[PDB]
Amino acid sequence: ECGWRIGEAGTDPNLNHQQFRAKILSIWEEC
Amino acid sequence: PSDKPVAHVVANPQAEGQLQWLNRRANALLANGVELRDNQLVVPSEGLYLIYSQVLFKGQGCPSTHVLLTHTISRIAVSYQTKVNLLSAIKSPCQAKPWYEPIYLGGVFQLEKGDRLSAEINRPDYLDFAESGQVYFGIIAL
C-alpha cells in the first residue's frame, strides 16, 4: 500500500530531511 | 532542495479522544521553517505543496449502526478564519470480529505563507496506536 510506504519512509533513520523529501515524492509519483 | 520546507509528524498515543500530533522534536520532523502550532502545520512560504496524512481505525466488533469513519485535511487562510476542505475520505468498518480501517489522504495544492493545515477525523474513539509511525501528517514543498 502507498499509505504504508509513506509511513516507512517517515520512520527511516537513514533519510535526512533532503533525502526523505525525495523519497516521498518518488512514492507519490507512482502512487 | 536542502532549503525546501518539509514536515512529518506522528500521532500522540497518550491523548484521549483526540488526533493530536506529537510536537516533541525527538519524533517530529519540522525542517526549513514549517512548524507545528495549535495542532496545525504552518506553511512558511508560498508554493506548491504535497500534503498527506494517514489514520488507522480499529474496533472489536460492529455496533448496530454503520459507524462511518471520516478523515479530512483542511486549510485555514493566513489572514482569515475560513477553513476549507482540501481532502476527505469516508469508510464503513461494518456492513464480534475485530476490524481495521486505514484511511490515507494525499494531493498537491497551492498554499500561501502562513496558511494553516489540519488533519482531522470524526471518531478518535476508534483510533489505534499499535502501528506507531503509520498515523502521520506531513507536507512537502515541491
Residue of B51, B83, B55 lying closest to B69 (CA atoms): B55
Handedness of CA B7, B47, B111, B71 (dihedral sign): negative
Q: Domain of B58? A: 1-142
Cell numbers at residue B123, please?
471518531
Instruction: Tell me which amino acid residue B60 is.
Output: Q
Distance CA B59, CA B101 (A): 9
Buried b / exposed e over B4-24, threshold 16 CB at 10 Å, is: bbbbbbbbbeeeeeebebbee
For B8, nearest residue in chain A (alpha carbons): A10
Which ranges of chain A would DSSP assign to H, the alpha helix?
A: 2-10, 17-30
In units of Å, what resolution does this entry have? 2.5
Written as one string, the DSSP assignment of B59-86 is: ESS--SS---EEEEEEEE-TTS--EEEE
Distance CA B45, CA B29 (A): 17
Domain ranges of chain A: 1-31
Written as one string, the DSSP assignment of B25-52 is: GGGEEEETT-EEETTEEE--S-EEEEEE
Phi, psi of B25 (to 5 degrees): -55, -25
Residue of B38, B30, B6, B15 lying closest to B141 (CA atoms): B6
CA distance A30 to chain B (A): 13
User: β-strand B35-37 against B6-10: which pairing, if any?
Assistant: unpaired
Residue of B47, B40, B46 lying closest to B73 (CA atoms): B40
Question: Total domain count for chain B?
Answer: 1
Q: Helix A17-30 crosses helix A2-10 at what angle (to 10 degrees)?
A: 170
Handedness of CA B26, B27, B30, B36 (dihedral sign): negative
Which of chain B's residues have a Cβ under 8 Å away from the Cβ of A7?
54, 131, 133-134, 136
